[PDB]
Design a protein around this nucleic acid. Sequence first.
DNA 1: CAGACCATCGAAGCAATCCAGCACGCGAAAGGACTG
DNA 2: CAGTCCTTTC
DNA 3: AAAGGACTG
RNA 4: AUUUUUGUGCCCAUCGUUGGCACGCGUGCUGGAUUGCUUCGAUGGUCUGC
Length: 1023
Amino acid sequence: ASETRKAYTTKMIPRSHDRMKLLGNFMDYLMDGTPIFFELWNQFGGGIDRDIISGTANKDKISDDLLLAVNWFKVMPINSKPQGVSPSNLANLFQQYSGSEPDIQAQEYFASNFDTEKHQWKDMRVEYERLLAELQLSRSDMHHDLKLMYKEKCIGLSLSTAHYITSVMFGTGAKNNRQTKHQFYSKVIQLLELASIILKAGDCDSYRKLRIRCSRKGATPSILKIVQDYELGTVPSLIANLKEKLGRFEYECEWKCMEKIKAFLASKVGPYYLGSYSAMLENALSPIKGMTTKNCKFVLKQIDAKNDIKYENEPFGKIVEGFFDSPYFEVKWVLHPHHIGESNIKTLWEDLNAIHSKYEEDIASLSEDKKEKRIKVYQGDVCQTINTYCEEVGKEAKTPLVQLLRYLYSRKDDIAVDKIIDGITFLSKKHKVEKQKINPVIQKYPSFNFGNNSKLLGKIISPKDKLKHNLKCNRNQVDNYIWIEIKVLNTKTMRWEKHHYALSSTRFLEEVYYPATSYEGKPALSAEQIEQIRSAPVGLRKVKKRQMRLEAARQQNLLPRYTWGKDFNINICKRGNNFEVTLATKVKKKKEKNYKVVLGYDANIVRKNTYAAIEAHANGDGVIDYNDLPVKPIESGFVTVESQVRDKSYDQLSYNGVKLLYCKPHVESRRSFLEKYNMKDFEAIADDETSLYYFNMKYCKLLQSSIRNHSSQAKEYREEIFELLRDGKLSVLKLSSLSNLSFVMFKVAKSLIGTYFGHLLKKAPPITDEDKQKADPEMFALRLALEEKRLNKVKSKKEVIANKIVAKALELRDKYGPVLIKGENISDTTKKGKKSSTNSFLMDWLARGVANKVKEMVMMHQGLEFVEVNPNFTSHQDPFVHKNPENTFRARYSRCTPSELTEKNRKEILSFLSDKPSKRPTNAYYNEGAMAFLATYGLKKNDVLGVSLEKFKQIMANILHQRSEDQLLFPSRGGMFYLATYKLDADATSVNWNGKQFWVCNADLVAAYNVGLVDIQKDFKKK
DNA sequence: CAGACCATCGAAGCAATCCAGCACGCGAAAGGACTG
DNA sequence: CAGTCCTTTC
DNA sequence: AAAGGACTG
RNA sequence: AUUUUUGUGCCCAUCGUUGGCACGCGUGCUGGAUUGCUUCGAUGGUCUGC
């Protein structure tokens, strides 16, 4: 039984200045009262101590000392009341309290990094003492009270729901059946320590009503006791649960100091109301308990990570870090393994040791006075080798520091190679683990959820009561506004009074609200509705069209019934003088395990994210027998989202813009401006086949470089920058798709504005964002426009890709059965070792974003389920033959004509053929792919590794002409057209390799199938 | 062979953005009182 | 009693 | 322990 | 309790054919990166008599 929330983000229509001011006063009252509860609960937690937490003692792995340190040592902003503790003396303070020194978990908590500029430790136990002093309540009485709170889960970790805490500590009356319930439970266990129903009924109770009226009154029935009795009249492991619940129901809830605390709250906050106090405490506890749990898990993670630091490589770390106090360095920084080609330095030192052996054997002979020259030659050779290594490893990752490698080689006798790697990775991991900031306890900006059951009373009126009201008072009965009846506290006269406010969210109408007076599509409108749509102002026409479609669907009985149910929350966040009603809604799923389809998707960056469906227990013509599971490919395609312009049909995700054949004035203006500032590179971007957003991106980079060169006149660039990014018909803001290139375009636009500002404000105080806002307010506004446009662009890309994925999942669910959407677990990209360009490229991936959006959407549909799989080798594994018997791991190719072969392709083929050891597992797969490429056409690598790439193209053309085919497959590390043994593409062109007769599928579709077979066995057990 | 010019590549500082994780909120069901 | 609200407990 | 996942429209 | 004028937005050389289409919101921190300026250091090369 899973559940998630919807959200409809409505718009508050000001009913009247008086009513809106009343609502604002109520909101301000709640907001002003929230900090009081925040501080009060910080004090309560501060009062925690041993003999308070030594009760249930239930906790995952948190030490009894870490709980104490968490509840009375919190990092908060410097500008707060509890201020006054420095990190150094945290240990001795924790010694002063609790009569013991910090343990490992509490030592890690105290010795945690943070931002000393903004956040400061805080004693949090002088705050409890200040509560005792300023409310003058006996320390013993407050000790009893907060011990009772802890046992009631009103303080500590895993707190209870705010409503419950308020009702318990500040409530009128009670069951008072604590001792009564304890006796009942002791009797029940004594009768155990449908038959259980008889045993429970033996509590001097005839039926459920009697025991309800005797043991547990005025609440929901105790754990499966009254419901159990009813079920049994209309397993033995529960004894431990009932015995551990006996800790409760023993105290009788006598508060020795909650009266004084309640009076203090009434002094600071208004008079006690369960709804108001519950809301304020709900918005005050969230930061407290949230950051408490976050820091507990964080400290556990920190101890686990520090246990992974070897700490025996520390001397090697010292030797390597001696780089900073050596002639080769000219400030000081941390050394990460990417500075030495993390694992390639082994090959580097192999080569350098070969050179050293040659040099030494040459120095043994030639013992004349030529040493001063031979050593110089050897020094030059080793320097050249190190430079070549840095250049070589600087293609797939960051260039290793030349000076660091020179220093390491100079210290070739003080440290080995594996020891160099261990020391530097120690320097890296220790530094990382030591810079992990601890989460501060920051105050939440409140939400104040109005509901019906346990929150501040309130409700959307109804679709039914709406008709009653709109008919009682003469009205169309089909208004486009949603009315909420909120119980507002009139702060003038401190009493409650339900008022009404109008929301105007059209989605709520279209989807769950509008009444069925008489997933779907849309209706056919009438003439007058069309006229209204066409007569509305420009900015209102879209919402008018949506509303008229809704109205037509109601008038033509095309509007499905929406089964109101009155299950909507109302979240009112008052930022300034405007409200932010939200209308959340619970959705319940009842997850299913007996899957019938698997819908993997590959989640590419530039290559048109694909899906691929796989059946579970297929029985038909093609049913591939996996390890022990009969599976069948249903289909596989691309995720293309269609925006149908007048007659064409674009893919927002891959359109890439118009072809510059219709942007000639645009390109002419750009060239005219660029000519004024120094153009053989412009002509390479302005071809009439080049697409518009490639042209815009490349021209943004051109402007960036131009501004860099003409630094002292970057103010002259602003007219062109505007005309390119904002104003003109073909601009980054006027015209841009969801394609990856259209996001690189916004990235380069933001970079262009950044360089314009950096060179417009450079003459040394730093250039703060306020300084550049004041320097060119229009350009800063343009920067904000680009940022907001790109953020909404990203939100829409996530939403639409996830919509297509979930739509195909629903199609398969309707056709076959419960679907399982398997997505790559694309984490830990954008690494330090990678190049800056690689990390920037991978930032636009939005893999985890789409995965999260699909995860959310799947929680609302019954039948779908989303698991995230390991993305390892999912682009090479041959689907349905890899792991069906044994791993296959073929390579990806690139069909092309011999005339369009480039130098890069030939060099890549040679790199595959060159028998050199590499740590990448896929090197073997692409090497065997290159061998098979040579075998297929008989190229005789010795004679194929030759020069004259033109001669290579001629030889390939002759080989492919002797055969009747037109294109040659050849392995490429970034090529499509994977070779599968099964037809997974639906456009696959069969081909003959050494002698296997593969299918030329699409690398995207086979990768989607692999994503659908990563752990197929786990999803489908043999049951 | 001394000297300067480009260029890219690292490191750090400074000021910014950004995708992402992750903790929390978006309570239920009951009885009594009340009202119609 | 239907529906409301206000409370306590799960 | 990375690599892999991505492959610069 | 009636405001009849809006939830957020996304795509397009013709911005409408009723254009086409999608959507969980908020707070707060944290992690990893990126962007821009500068400083420093390496790396590669053209150039002037040598």
